[PDB]
């Protein structure tokens with residue numbers, strides 16, 4: 001039974017190293033992955049690799065041998081390394097939340113305000129301060145318990161049980177974990193509220209129109225380009241190429257950049273908006289609407305034209321009358337539902353509720369944000385039991401046995417392998433992992 005545990009544990013060490021080197025090397029090799037967010041994730045992956053190389057193996061040995069055998073120096077050092085990693089980890093996540101926050105409330109949404117170089121220094125500082133507040137307490141013996149049972153473990157080279165004074169337990173916890181955890185959760189839940197609230201029509205259309213820079217066909221059959229920008233309803237491909245070159249003013253040959261695409265997209269919307277104001281049957285309803293459903297109304301016009309969207313007189317009767325639930329039924333009773341249901345669903349909900357809840361986590365950088373949300377939430381769930389129970393030991397001396405402290409600590413250890421797996425959400429990281437694993 002001791003043996004099975006040792007396989008389980010060995011598997012873990014390898015999962016942390018395999019996982020984390022795979023994260024670190026990807027970022028090292030591919031210049032596309034070198035961003036401010038991915039610089040911090042490297043420092044996060046380093047702490048997990050140092051955890052997996054230095055902390056975890058020696059813990060497993062300590063458990064199974066039932067005694068420390070590495071000499072009191074590496075006992076003290078093993079601890080400071082271990083404390084250093086948990087402190088550097090949580091404070092990196094905190095910094096990542098703040099970097100996200102200042103990104104999303106800038107005019108450059110989703111892009112960091114830090115430079116690559118200024119970022120590198122933020123990482124060094126985190127480690128410098130973390131190192132000092134992890135090591136000095138430990139090496140200067142300031143952590144040490146005064147009572148006898150502890151003092152017997154100190155002067156023994158084969159006892160490495162972690163014993164600390166009440167005041168250290170509190171002071172180390174608040175600064176090492178509670179402060180950054182709290183700032184992280186506060187800030188990042190606002191980074192989610194910023195994204196949701198800062199959704200405009202441009203992202204909304206991008207989400208359910210897609211983007212292609214080569215010429216393609218819509219489900220109607222006609223030639224389209226960019227973000228759902230029709231070129232012609234003529235079946236001749238050269239006619240499409242001709243209408244594109246006419247639009248941009250360049251010999252594209254079916255190839256355009258995002259620059260040329262988003263300029264078209266902006267012209268397309270403004271005209272779709274102009275068209276709603278010009279049309280007599282639509283304009284009255286548009287003034288009636290809040291900013292959100294205003295965008296829901298342009299979304300249709302973009303797709304079906306000013307004429308067509310002026311066809312749904314009943315839907316427009318009831319939207320003018322604010323009966324969102326009633327208008328959604330009639331919009332369901334339409335060929336538009338039958339032709340494109342996934343878009344219809346999303347657009348109808350927006351009319352229904354009046355919120356972006358049908359479009360959450362749909363945009364790319366909104367998926368990028370959720371992934372970052374998932375690593376943060378997991379680290380919380382992995383350590384919070386351990387850290388709370390650590391504080392409840394200091395308040396109530398007898399509630400917390402050895403077995404529980406070690407087990408809870410070990411859910412925290414298991415956290416060092418999860419991040420690489422969670423990055424497989426990112427199709428940037430997924431493509432990277434396969435290339436490196438030569439699949």
Ligand SMILES: CC(C)CCC[C@@H](C)[C@H]1CC[C@H]2[C@@H]3CC=C4C[C@@H](O)CC[C@]4(C)[C@H]3CC[C@]12C
Nearest residue numbers: 039042043044046047050081120121123124127
């Ligand atoms: C084992 C313990 C005691 C020592 C490990 C700490 C040092 C060597 C490591 C841990 C994390 C590392 C950083 C991780 C992030 C990278 C970003 C990269 O673009 C430049 C180097 C930089 C900034 C690293 C510098 C060295 C670093 C701070």
Ligand SMILES: CC(C)CCC[C@@H](C)[C@H]1CC[C@H]2[C@@H]3CC=C4C[C@@H](O)CC[C@]4(C)[C@H]3CC[C@]12C
Nearest residue numbers: 024025027028042045046049050051053054055
């Ligand atoms: C006792 C043991 C665990 C100490 C060894 C710590 C190792 C894992 C640390 C020390 C220095 C670190 C490296 C410092 C330089 C950076 C360059 C960056 O672009 C990719 C990560 C990389 C390459 C770091 C990866 C992790 C690293 C190699």
Ligand SMILES: C=CCc1ccccc1OC[C@@H](O)CNC(C)C
Nearest residue numbers: 079082083086087162169172173176
């Ligand atoms: C109060 C100590 C708990 C603690 C505080 C700050 C940073 C890390 C902390 O705990 C990490 C654990 O992995 C320690 N494990 C011990 C050393 C066996």
